[PDB]
């Protein structure tokens, strides 16, 4: 229907064209008949009838008279919904300035007229004059005159000049302006200007003037003469129960405006004294400003609630505004909500749904099937049968929901795994039954949690739920690629208990034919689950090439391990099950099953694992008791020793040998050491036991303590919590953060006293409050990331670019932090991976690096590779499939139309709640910094080189001595400037001292061409440079935090990308959160979307102008094809908020935040919204250009071009 949204200024003729009449009276409804009043805010002659196909008279009261205007009233006989579309207008007695174009900084009227806002307000506030036509007088246009001065020059010259007050003066000045003449004069002045501030001022004014000329808008339209009036049904006055009426504040504001306008007209009819007329005009201006934007001009007008009235700007803007409350998010039909329970019998794609709840949700389908089979003749009969709840209705409901997917969603939806598709199963109850394995996906526990359900209606939606959103497809985490359906708690505990080993168990040493005989022995009470036996295992390996090799051999194992192998699918080794299975082992089993067998086998294996774990956790009988918490006997001795030497050092303090701070420090140190010793003793006492073996001797066995088993299996608990239960609680902090000297020397088994409990509450309250605030911080950060990256969609397959980023193992000392395999998993090779010291192409170009090639690289021992990245992509809009790589949630190359930006933003923002020189290897030494490289050719040590035992290339043996998170991520993504940034070498040359100017110092640098560049530096700076040294570009002069803008300007795109990725990943890896770097590079690419033009060239770009990089790239390509001088640009780094607000589309910018500024800029410029992103299509209700809509949108674009031909 429509392809673009055009915004701009509204002319009075256009406003009259919109309006269906003029509102002349502030009347709303009669107080007796409750009927609209003529020429009022609710007039039926202007806005439409209040009853369908009726008139206020009642003479025309049926449909035969449609479109006929009653002669007695004037009300057109039509539908009432026209009252939601029909507009009105008010003919204002005097012009009023638009508040948005006057007080939204920068003031557009002041910018256009080159006058300060204060002077314009003084003219508007009726204080001092302004000259409109100077005439044949020394007076100049736009200069300000006091009343006394006005009288003097009026007695002097008389009618030769015209000087006015108010918005009439501003409109008579704006209309007298010649935009082309001003543009030419300011172009000439900018050509012969030198000052930078003046350059900025007139370049802004020139941009505004050229925008006005290009858009076709007139400046005088910024002063309102005709005021449009909203449809009554959008500002309704409707009766409540009990005779009360509910009204909108817009009615009060409109009534005020109409009353003041009518009073002004009456005063002008009476030939009023001037002062009263000026007061009335001020009141009219104030009323119009309050109606448009209340509180911006001055004191906000309040009603009878002592609370400010809500205006149109408040109605369209804010968190509670239309954009965020009704356009980007809506309340929907065919939805429900219920508490969630656990269904251990369900399959991974099944969810338990109440029968009544499904009956209410699927009611139209039940009607359709009740008529199709002839059980109900008409829809009323079907409704009656559904209401009476007959058995055939239940059968119809069962047939309806058979293969109909349903959507389950839990708030908050941090990532896309928070909404999934399941097959409903009717259950007797009122609570939704949920599969346990999806709980980690939902972050849901059964302590009162509620989940919402949605019913996809169309066939397309059902197939989308079945194919994309089904739980069986979403078993890999899109943030990392690791499995997300890993077992936890009871399943892990059962698999751990069954796979444990016991010494001298019943049935030890027996020989079993296989898992079936092991199960038979277990059920017959012949052998225990933990008896060491020898089992004949038939084991099949599916190799990388697809070879299926079956080997039958006898393996030493336990009965439980074979019984668990009974459910392991074919194609996996027995070594995965021939061990005690914690959370890590089961996760590895599931990952191997996915990587070697597929998805269906993985789903069945996960279901069987959950069933077996639940069953054998039930059969285990694991229980927590007061005897399971064994406090070590060494704890009391250690406490006594610590207290004694505390007494000794207190005596030392009374002697003056040490200060109070040293005493505090060593008391804290000893208390930490004693806590560590007590924890070690308790862990040793809890982890082991002595048993009698077959020979009769005493053997060492791992303990079967319930708490120890819970902690070791990884189901629930850790070493720290066991330490608090059976050891020491440790030192705690004061509310400010300082650590109390005396720690809690008691655990929870013995019990704390009053003081220790109070100290514990000190930190518990801090933790709870920190969680509460960090949740909101993470939500805001995620929203900003989504709004900055929502436009990134995979649009092509290959962009044909040779650029890429270099990838090496991440080294932070003598050990590797992350391997090259982890970073290269799923990336496309940019240049061929040659074998070290050889010219053989091991891995060719444009090949995805999967597990096989990762193993190949690890075996070959390749150190540095180059891969394609989203930041270096050449795609005009979005990115291409190859530059992105494997999609972590699916395992293959990313498909066309994937909204990778939203996935990246969600992946980064979801863990926000969790967020708060001696050589050690044998090899050679290489200098660039200090690097130690092994004999295989891998760099295994990286260390800094402050300004040595071995020289470059000298072999070094082992042991030789050569000699806070979430705010950090927020500032990193916002490109925040550090308070004390590091001074960086702007240009390459030799350093030279200069005049030590008072206040702060100056320095100079001599380039290769002899040009001297001056640098301004503060006094308090520990300089690293020395005179006579040629410092390279990007060398550090003053140490400190590095500004990302400086890194981008002086090092390049790759350097800033690496810096941001490394810092964000350091913050995340400190907490143990695994997030792929392509997400952070999809955010960094969005940051680097603007360029400032340095060389204008012949393209339509001005120097000092910030424009989009893609447009400049296309313009440069066109100019090169035309053989004309191309443009030169300097890429700019913007934060996520500024990049979000600097988008080409104004709908998305207005929907994000600061609607007033965005709308004002779009209106003055006359911007056009092409609806190319997700948010615009969501707001206008069209298909998003991502996924299943992608092809659709593509088709339209083709037709566009084909028609434009």
């Amino acid at each position: 229907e429509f392809d673009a949204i055009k915004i701009g200024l509204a002319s009075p003729d256009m406003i009259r064209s919109w309006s269906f009449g003029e509102v002349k009276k502030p009347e709303t409804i009669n107080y007796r008949t409750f009927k609209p009043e003529r020429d009022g805010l609710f007039c039926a002659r202007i806005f439409g009838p209040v009853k369908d196909y009726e008139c206020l008279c009642g003479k025309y009261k049926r449909l035969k008279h449609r479109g006929v205007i009653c002669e007695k009233c004037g009300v057109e006989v039509t539908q009432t919904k026209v009252r939601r579309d029909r507009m009105g207008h008010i003919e204002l007695a005097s012009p009023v300035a638009h508040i948005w174009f006057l007080k939204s900084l920068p003031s557009r009227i002041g910018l256009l007229m080159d006058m300060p806002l204060r002077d314009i307000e003084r003219v508007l506030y009726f204080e001092m004059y302004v000259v409109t036509e100077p005439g044949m007088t020394d007076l100049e246009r736009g200069q300000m005159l006091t009343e006394e001065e006005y009288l003097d020059r009026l007695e002097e010259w008389g009618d030769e000049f015209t000087a006015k007050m108010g918005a009439e003066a501003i409109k008579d000045l704006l209309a007298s302006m010649d935009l082309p003449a001003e543009a030419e004069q300011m172009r000439e002045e900018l050509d012969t200007t030198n000052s930078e501030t003046k350059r900025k001022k007139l370049t802004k004014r020139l941009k505004l003037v050229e925008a006005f000329v290009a858009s076709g808008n007139k400046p005088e339209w910024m002063i309102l003469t005709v005021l449009p009036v909203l449809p009554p049904d959008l500002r309704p006055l409707v009766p409540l129960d009990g005779g009360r009426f509910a009204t909108s504040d817009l009615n009060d504001l409109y009534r005020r405006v109409i009353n003041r306008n009518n009073r002004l007209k009456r005063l002008l009819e009476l030939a009023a004294p001037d002062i009263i007329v000026r007061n009335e005009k001020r009141m009219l201006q104030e009323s119009v400003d309050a109606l448009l934007d209340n509180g911006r001009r001055g004191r906000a007008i309040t009603g009878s609630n002592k609370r400010p009235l809500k205006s149109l700007a408040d109605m369209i803007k804010g968190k509670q505004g239309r954009f965020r409350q009704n356009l980007l998010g809506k309340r929907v039909d065919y939805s429900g909500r219920s508490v969630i329970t656990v269904g251990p019998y369900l399959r991974l794609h099944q969810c338990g749904l109440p029968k009544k709840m499904a009956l209410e949700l699927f009611k139209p389908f039940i009607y359709s099937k009740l008529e199709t089979r002839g059980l109900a003749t008409t829809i009323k009969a079907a409704k009656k049968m559904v209401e009476r709840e007959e058995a055939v209705v239940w059968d119809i409901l069962d047939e309806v929901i058979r293969e109909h997917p349903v959507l389950l969603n839990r708030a908050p939806t941090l990532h896309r795994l928070g909404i999934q598709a399941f097959e409903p199963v009717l259950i007797e109850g009122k609570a939704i039954q949920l599969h346990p394995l999806v709980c980690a996906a939902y972050n849901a526990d059964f302590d009162g949690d509620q989940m919402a359900v949605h019913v996809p209606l169309t066939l397309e939606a059902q197939l989308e739920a079945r194919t994309l959103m089904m739980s069986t497809n979403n078993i890999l985490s899109p943030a990392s690629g690791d499995p997300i359906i890993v077992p936890s708690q009871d399943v892990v505990l059962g698999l751990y208990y069954m796979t444990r080993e016991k010494i001298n168990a019943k049935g030890e040493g027996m020989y079993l034919t296989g898992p079936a005989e092991a199960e038979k022995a277990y059920r017959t009470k012949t052998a225990e689950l933990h008896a060491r036996v020898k089992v004949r295992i038939t084991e099949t390996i599916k190799h990388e090439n697809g070879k299926l090799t079956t080997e039958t051999k006898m393996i030493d194992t336990t009965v439980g391990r074979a019984m668990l192998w009974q459910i392991v699918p074919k194609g996996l080794p027995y070594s995965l099950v021939n061990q005690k299975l914690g959370k890590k082992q089961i996760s590895n089993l599931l990952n191997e099953a996915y990587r070697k067998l597929g998805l269906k086998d993985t789903v069945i294996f996960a279901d069987q694992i959950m069933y077996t774990g639940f069953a054998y956790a039930a059969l285990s009988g694991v229980s927590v008791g007061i005897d399971d918490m064994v406090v070590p006997a060494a704890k009391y001795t250690e406490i006594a020793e610590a207290e004694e030497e505390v007494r000794e050092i207190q005596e030392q303090f009374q002697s003056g040998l040490v200060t109070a701070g040293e005493r505090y420090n060593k008391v804290i140190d000893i208390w930490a050491s004693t806590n560590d010793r007590v924890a070690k003793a308790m862990m040793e006492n809890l982890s082991s036991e002595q048993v009698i073996n077959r020979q009769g001797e005493q053997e060492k066995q791992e303990s079967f303590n319930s708490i120890y088993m819970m902690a070791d299996s990884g189901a629930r608990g850790s070493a720290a919590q066991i330490r608090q239960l059976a050891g020491m609680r440790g030192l705690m902090a004061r509310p400010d953060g300082s650590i109390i000297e005396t720690p809690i020397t008691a655990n929870f088994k013995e019990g704390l006293n009053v003081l220790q409990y109070f100290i514990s509450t000190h930190g518990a309250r801090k933790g709870l409050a920190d969680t509460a605030l960090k949740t909101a911080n993470s939500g805001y950060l995620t929203r900003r990331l989504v709004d900055v990256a929502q436009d990134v969609v995979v649009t092509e397959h290959d962009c044909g670019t040779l650029e890429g980023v270099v990838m090496t193992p991440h080294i932070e000392g003598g050990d590797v932090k992350v391997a090259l395999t982890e970073l290269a998993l799923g990336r496309v090779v940019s240049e061929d991976i040659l074998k070290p010291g050889t010219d053989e192409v091991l891995i060719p170009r444009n090949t995805l690096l999967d597990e096989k090639w990762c193993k190949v690289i690890n075996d070959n021992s390749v150190d540095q590779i180059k891969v394609r990245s989203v930041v270096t992509c050449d795609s005009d809009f979005g990115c291409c499939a190859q530059c992105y790589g494997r999609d972590l949630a699916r395992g293959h190359l990313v498909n066309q139309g994937e909204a990778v930006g939203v996935i990246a933003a969600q992946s980064i923002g979801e863990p926000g709640t969790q967020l708060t020189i001696q050589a050690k290897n044998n090899g050679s030494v290489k200098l660039h910094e200090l690097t130690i490289i092994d004999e295989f050719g891998r760099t295994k040590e990286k260390h800094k080189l402050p300004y040595l035992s071995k020289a470059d290339g000298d072999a070094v043996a082992a042991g030789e001595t050569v000699a806070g998170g979430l705010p950090r991520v927020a500032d990193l993504f916002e490109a925040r400037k550090p308070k004390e940034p590091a001074i960086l070498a702007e240009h390459s040359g030799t350093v030279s001292f200069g005049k030590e100017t008072k206040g702060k110092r100056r320095l100079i640098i001599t380039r290769d061409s002899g040009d001297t560049y001056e640098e301004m530096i503060p006094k308090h700076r520990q300089l690293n440079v020395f005179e006579g040294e040629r410092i390279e570009r990007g060398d550090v002069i003053a140490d400190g935090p590095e500004s990302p803008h400086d890194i981008l300007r002086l090092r390049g795109i790759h350097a800033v990308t690496t810096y941001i990725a490394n810092e964000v990943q350091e913050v995340y890896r400190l907490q143990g959160v695994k997030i792929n770097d392509k997400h952070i590079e999809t955010i960094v690419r969005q940051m680097l979307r603007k360029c400032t033009i340095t060389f204008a060239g012949d393209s339509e770009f001005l120097p000092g102008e910030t424009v989009e990089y893609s447009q400049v790239k296309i313009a440069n390509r066109k100019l090169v094809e035309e053989g004309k001088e191309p443009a030169r640009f300097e890429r700019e780094l913007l934060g996520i908020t500024k990049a979000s607000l600097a988008t080409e589309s104004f709908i998305s910018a207005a929907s994000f935040q600061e609607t007033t500024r965005v709308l004002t800029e779009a209106a003055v410029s006359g911007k056009r919204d092409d609806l190319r992103g997700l948010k615009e299509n969501v707001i206008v209700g069209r298909l998003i250009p991502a996924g299943t809509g992608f092809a659709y949108h593509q088709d339209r674009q083709a037709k566009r071009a084909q028609e434009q031909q």
């Binding site: 293969e403 066939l459 397309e460 059902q462 079945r466 194919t467 994309l468 497809n473």
Partner: protein, 81 residues
Amino acid sequence: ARVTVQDAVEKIGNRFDLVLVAARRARQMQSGGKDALVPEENDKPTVIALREIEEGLITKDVLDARERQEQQEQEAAELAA
């Protein structure tokens, strides 16, 4: 009945294109009079279309081909009138 839409995405390659093709086939079988090429086995049109795609009987090529065929046949029939 069917679960785990793997074979279909292997035959098609792209999940979204598969969704669109299956939606077209299901609309043909439900709104139109077209019959299934596989035993129904008490399955909804979406499941039948997915099974047909898995068996290789239905692709985008086939659908567009037979749609153009129906337009040609209808044009010839209207000429015959």
